[PDB]
Amino acid sequence: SYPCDEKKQNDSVIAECSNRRLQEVPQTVGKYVTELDLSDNFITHITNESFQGLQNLTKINLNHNPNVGLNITDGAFLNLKNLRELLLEDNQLPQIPSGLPESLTELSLIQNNIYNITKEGISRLINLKNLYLAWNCYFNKVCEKTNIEDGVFETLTNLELLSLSFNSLSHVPPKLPSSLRKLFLSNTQIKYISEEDFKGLINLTLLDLSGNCPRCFNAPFPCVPCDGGASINIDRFAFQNLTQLRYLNLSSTSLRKINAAWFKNMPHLKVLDLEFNYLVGEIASGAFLTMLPRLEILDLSFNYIKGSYPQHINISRNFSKLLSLRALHLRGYVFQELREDDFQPLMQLPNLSTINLGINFIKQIDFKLFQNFSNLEIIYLSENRISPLVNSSSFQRHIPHSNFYHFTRPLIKPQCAAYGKALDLSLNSIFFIGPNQFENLPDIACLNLSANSNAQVLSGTEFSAIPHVKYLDLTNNRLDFDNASALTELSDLEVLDLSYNSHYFRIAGVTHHLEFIQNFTNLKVLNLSHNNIYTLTDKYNLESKSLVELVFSGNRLDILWNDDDNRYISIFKGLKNLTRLDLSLNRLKHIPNEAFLNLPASLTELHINDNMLKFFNWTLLQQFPRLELLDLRGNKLLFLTDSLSDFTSSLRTLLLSHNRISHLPSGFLSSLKHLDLSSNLLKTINKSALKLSMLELHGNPFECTCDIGDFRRWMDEHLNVKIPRLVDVICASPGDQRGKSIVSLELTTCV
Ligand SMILES: *[C@@H]1O[C@H](CO)[C@@H](O[C@@H]2O[C@H](CO)[C@@H](O[C@@H]3O[C@H](CO[C@H]4O[C@H](CO)[C@@H](O)[C@H](O)[C@@H]4O)[C@@H](O)[C@H](O[C@H]4O[C@H](CO)[C@@H](O)[C@H](O)[C@@H]4O)[C@@H]3O)[C@H](O)[C@H]2NC(C)=O)[C@H](O)[C@H]1NC(C)=O
Numbered sequence: 244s245y246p247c248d249e250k251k252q253n254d255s256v257i258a259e260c261s262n263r264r265l266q267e268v269p270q271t272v273g274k275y276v277t278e279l280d281l282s283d284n285f286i287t288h289i290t291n292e293s294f295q296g297l298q299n300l301t302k303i304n305l306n307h308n309p310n311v312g313l314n315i316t317d318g319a320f321l322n323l324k325n326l327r328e329l330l331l332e333d334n335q336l337p338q339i340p341s342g343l344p345e346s347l348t349e350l351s352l353i354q355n356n357i358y359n360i361t362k363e364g365i366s367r368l369i370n371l372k373n374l375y376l377a378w379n380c381y382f383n384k385v386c387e388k389t390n391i392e393d394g395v396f397e398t399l400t401n402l403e404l405l406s407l408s409f410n411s412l413s414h415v416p417p418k419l420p421s422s423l424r425k426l427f428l429s430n431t432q433i434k435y436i437s438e439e440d441f442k443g444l445i446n447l448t449l450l451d452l453s454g455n456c457p458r459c460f461n462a463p464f465p466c467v468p469c470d471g472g473a474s475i476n477i478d479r480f481a482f483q484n485l486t487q488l489r490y491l492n493l494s495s496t497s498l499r500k501i502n503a504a505w506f507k508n509m510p511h512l513k514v515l516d517l518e519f520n521y522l523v524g525e526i527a528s529g530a531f532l533t534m535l536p537r538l539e540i541l542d543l544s545f546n547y548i549k550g551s552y553p554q555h556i557n558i559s560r561n562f563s564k565l566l567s568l569r570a571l572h573l574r575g576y577v578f579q580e581l582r583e584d585d586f587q588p589l590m591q592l593p594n595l596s597t598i599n600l601g602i603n604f605i606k607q608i609d610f611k612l613f614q615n616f617s618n619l620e621i622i623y624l625s626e627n628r629i630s631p632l633v634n635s636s637s638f639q640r641h642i643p644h645s646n647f648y649h650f651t652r653p654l655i656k657p658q659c660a661a662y663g664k665a666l667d668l669s670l671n672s673i674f675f676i677g678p679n680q681f682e683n684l685p686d687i688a689c690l691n692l693s694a695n696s697n698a699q700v701l702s703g704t705e706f707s708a709i710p711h712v713k714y715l716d717l718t719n720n721r722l723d724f725d726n727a728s729a730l731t732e733l734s735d736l737e738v739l740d741l742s743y744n745s746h747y748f749r750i751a752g753v754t755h756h757l758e759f760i761q762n763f764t765n766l767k768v769l770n771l772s773h774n775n776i777y778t779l780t781d782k783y784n785l786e787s788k789s790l791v792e793l794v795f796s797g798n799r800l801d802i803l804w805n806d807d808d809n810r811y812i813s814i815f816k817g818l819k820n821l822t823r824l825d826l827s828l829n830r831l832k833h834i835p836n837e838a839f840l841n842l843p844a845s846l847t848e849l850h851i852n853d854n855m856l857k858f859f860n861w862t863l864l865q866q867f868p869r870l871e872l873l874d875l876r877g878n879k880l881l882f883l884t885d886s887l888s889d890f891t892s893s894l895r896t897l898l899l900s901h902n903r904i905s906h907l908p909s910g911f912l913s914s915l916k917h918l919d920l921s922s923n924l925l926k927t928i929n930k931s932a933l934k935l936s937m938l939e940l941h942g943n944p945f946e947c948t949c950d951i952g953d954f955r956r957w958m959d960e961h962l963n964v965k966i967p968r969l970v971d972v973i974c975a976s977p978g979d980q981r982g983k984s985i986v987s988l989e990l991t992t993c994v
């Protein structure tokens with residue numbers, strides 16, 4: 244299957260064929276295909292010729308064509324009347340391709356030049372459930388405003404989703420179809436919303452009016468405010484008939500007042516986005532809060548008053564009325580202290596599991612207040628000013644197809660929250676953890692203390708008040724490991740991340756003690772990456788009866804092993820239950836044979852990539868019966884073993900990309916399902932016949948003489964072995980040949 248990778252399932256077959264440098268649509272496309280993917284190519288012409296009696300095709304993706312306009316022939320797709328989804332994004336169009344099929348349910352024309360939405364190109368469409376027209380006249384192109392001729396949509400009676408964001412409309416278009424469920428109009432330069440704007444949209448569940456009269460604060464053009472920094476103006480009766488509304492986005496509309504009356508007839512509102520407005524007032528005395536007993540997510544982030552740095556956050560009593568609230572986002576309100584009384588209104592909300600107070604520059608917090616909550620699972624306090632526990636103004640400056648407006652990535656890694664209540668204190672000033680640092684905290688399972696300039700010597704008492712932490716993140720600090728009892732008070736610890744604490748490890752004379760590792764009975768994952776460890780004090784071996792994974796990259800094994808009295812010859816041996824080991828980025832030029840033999844026999848996965856090894860004693864693989872993955876990418880390897888099977892019976896994956904292998908020997912030979920030989924120095928592959936699902940080869944300098952026949956043969960016979968990127972497997976020589984994919988070859992002249 245070339246050049247498109249025909250993948251199968253589920254209950255339909257698709258031809259993955261994008262980003263292959265195509266100038267055209269291959270005709271040689273397996274019949275009876277559900278849909279085709281042709282995004283990210285150089286195609287420039289779409290025509291009747293283009294799709295011939297495909298018939299079967301339901302979906303077509305032609306986005307990003309070409310990667311520098313796109314020419315399309317009227318009625319080009321009509322030959323396909325089973326076409327339901329058509330994607331034409333980033334194709335630089337200046338009009339809605341005329342003559343479009345009526346079988347379309349979904350049509351995307353995002354990121355194009357279309358400034359006129361018309362009945363000729365649209366109204367026929369009829370079966371459209373989803374229509375996307377975002378990013379066409381987003382000043383400038385140049386483009387004054389988007390023009391929608393009156394009634395273009397009313398004939399689309401099955402229209403469930405209409406997206407017109409990032410287009411200058413000035414006014415909401417009339418004659419909208421009552422079937423609408425989602426209406427996106429973010430950044431449409433609409434300043435006034437009238438009573439009649441959404442008159443008959445009785446089925447709306449989502450309305451996005453964000454970025455209209457934005458609060459540009461600390462941003463330049465294309466961010467453009469309404470004259471005099473005025474907020475969007477919404478009529479009192481603008482939403483009286485939108486009783487099905489679940490999601491309302493009013494982020495960055497420069498609102499100062501929220502009219503409670505807008506919500507009288509909106510009992511189902513689950514999500515309300517009010518980020519990037521000027522609502523500190525409303526937050527203190529907002530009547531609109533009494534109208535939302537069913538709200539689950541309220542985002543009030545970045546509503547700070549420039550230059551204001553109040554002592555306390557002023558949260559209205561009415562917050563107590565948001566009985567269905569599950570998450571409250573209060574980033575960037577900016578205040579100095581959080582007292583138990585300040586959060587009174589929220590202590591009764593039964594479903595509140597997430598409180599986000601990131602970026603508030605809070606100096607003090609009465610932590611006992613968190614114990615008075617029914618369901619907190621996530622306490623996000625990153626980027627605050629908590630100090631070790633023994634003003635009047637401030638200068639805070641803030642600086643797709645995607646959004647919601649809140650960094651949709653989770654607040655805490657999921658591998659961490661999964662264990663329980665999570666507390667994030669990263670990016671604070673806990674440069675030293677005091678004796679009462681964590682007093683009065685609920686039972687925390689997940690804790691992040693990353694990036695706090697902490698240079699202390701942990702001694703075994705710092706976490707006595709929260710001894711049930713399972714996942715502890717101590718990355719990016721300058722901890723001084725000079726006490727064997729460090730962290731032993733966390734008997735339940737399962738994941739410990741000490742990455743990026745190189746500062747004391749680098750200094751000669753300072754002592755380093757990692758003995759605490761063995762004291763944990765349930766420790767599973769330990770990451771000591773990027774610590775430049777090159778010596779240990781007194782106790783030279785890491786040991787754990789439980790540890791399963793050890794990430795030791797970015798340290799200095801070259802020094803620990805490559806020199807010495809064999810002090811660290813058995814450094815990892817005592818990791819009796821280890822299955823994964825990362826030794827990348829350790830500047831290894833040579834591994835002592837006994838050093839390698841002492842790695843735990845229990846290993847199933849070993850990474851040694853990105854070192855500088857030139858030889859590898861394969862024979863050593865004999866002592867690793869359970870070894871399934873072996874990674875050696877990014878080295879300087881020269882030769883391969885001639886008898887691989889006399890050493891391994893379990894190896895399944897072998898990664899050797901970015902090496903200096905120039906000759907693949909006889910064989911091999913095997914449980915080996917994956918082999919990566921991409922980016923090496925293979926001029927050609929000698930016959931080497933024969934159970935493997937994948938073989939990577941792009942990047943080698945192949946010699947395209949008739950010798951490329953044995954191999955060329957090989958592939959033809961085995962379409963059962965995936966060769967990702969055949970397109971990139973290229974001829975290095977000879978010169979007429981060079982640059983040509985080893986399959987494009989006009990072999991015939993070979994006779
Ligand atoms: C210190 O060292 C530790 C340990 O290695 C690092 O933490 C690990 O980080 C790795 C890499 O981020 C994590 O692996 C990732 O896990 C994600 C979540 O997995 C869960 O959910 C999936 C399905 O979503 C299940 O399959 C799975 O069993 C888990 O329940 C995955 O989503 C990630 O995606 C992977 O697969 C996709 C396939 O599409 C690929 O696109 C990705 O590239 C990737 O291969 C990935 O598997 C691992 O969870 C971490 N361990 C822990 C305990 O957190 C630290 O980050 C490191 N510290 C620093 C600073 O580097």
Ligand SMILES: *[C@@H]1O[C@H](CO)[C@@H](O[C@@H]2O[C@H](CO)[C@@H](O[C@@H]3O[C@H](CO[C@H]4O[C@H](CO)[C@@H](O)[C@H](O)[C@@H]4O)[C@@H](O)[C@H](O)[C@@H]3O)[C@H](O)[C@H]2NC(C)=O)[C@H](O)[C@H]1NC(C)=O
Nearest residue numbers: 425429449451453454490491492514516644645646647648
């Ligand atoms: C204003 O707030 C709005 C209310 O939340 C925001 O609306 C959201 O906008 C985002 C981005 O445009 C949409 O997210 C996308 O959704 C599609 C659809 O995926 C569907 O299928 C997947 C299966 O994989 C499923 O998991 C989803 O739940 C969907 O059913 C995705 O394909 C995209 O990758 C992306 O996630 C939201 O869907 C949309 N919310 C809703 C409820 O429709 C809006 O973005 C905000 N405005 C701005 C300017 O930020």
Ligand SMILES: *[C@@H]1O[C@H](CO)[C@@H](O[C@@H]2O[C@H](CO)[C@@H](O)[C@H](O)[C@H]2NC(C)=O)[C@H](O)[C@H]1NC(C)=O
Nearest residue numbers: 625654655656659669670691693694716718719
């Ligand atoms: C602890 O918080 C830190 C800081 O926010 C997180 O580290 C960042 O992680 C993100 C995404 O993984 C990266 O884009 C940043 O570069 C990281 N910054 C720093 C300072 O390291 C970290 O992921 C958090 N840890 C957990 C377990 O949630």
Ligand SMILES: *[C@@H]1O[C@H](CO)[C@@H](O)[C@H](O)[C@H]1NC(C)=O
Nearest residue numbers: 442443444445480483484485
């Ligand atoms: C819109 O709201 C007004 C308010 O009186 C009401 O009279 C009208 O019936 C509503 N329209 C629809 C279609 O529900």
Ligand SMILES: *[C@@H]1O[C@H](CO)[C@@H](O)[C@H](O)[C@H]1NC(C)=O
Nearest residue numbers: 583584587590591592615616
């Ligand atoms: C504890 O929570 C309840 C609300 O559930 C509240 O009445 C009480 O005042 C809180 N305790 C303190 C000390 O704030």
Ligand SMILES: *[C@@H]1O[C@H](CO)[C@@H](O)[C@H](O)[C@H]1NC(C)=O
Nearest residue numbers: 567569592593594595617618
């Ligand atoms: C909210 O909390 C109540 C009481 O703990 C629980 O019964 C309910 O299921 C929770 N709501 C959701 C949506 O999980």
Ligand SMILES: *[C@@H]1O[C@H](CO)[C@@H](O)[C@H](O)[C@H]1NC(C)=O
Nearest residue numbers: 701702703704726727728729
């Ligand atoms: C570790 O720290 C504890 C508390 O400071 C201390 O009592 C002990 O002497 C230190 N040294 C060792 C090796 O445990």
Ligand SMILES: *[C@@H]1O[C@H](CO)[C@@H](O)[C@H](O)[C@H]1NC(C)=O
Nearest residue numbers: 703728731732758759761762
């Ligand atoms: C940790 O293990 C070492 C060596 O077995 C032992 O000396 C020490 O008492 C242990 N520490 C704790 C807190 O259990």
Ligand SMILES: *[C@@H]1O[C@H](CO)[C@@H](O)[C@H](O)[C@H]1NC(C)=O
Nearest residue numbers: 764765767788789790791820
């Ligand atoms: C070995 O690792 C496995 C997998 O996490 C774990 O279940 C087992 O308890 C570990 N062994 C010991 C001795 O803790």
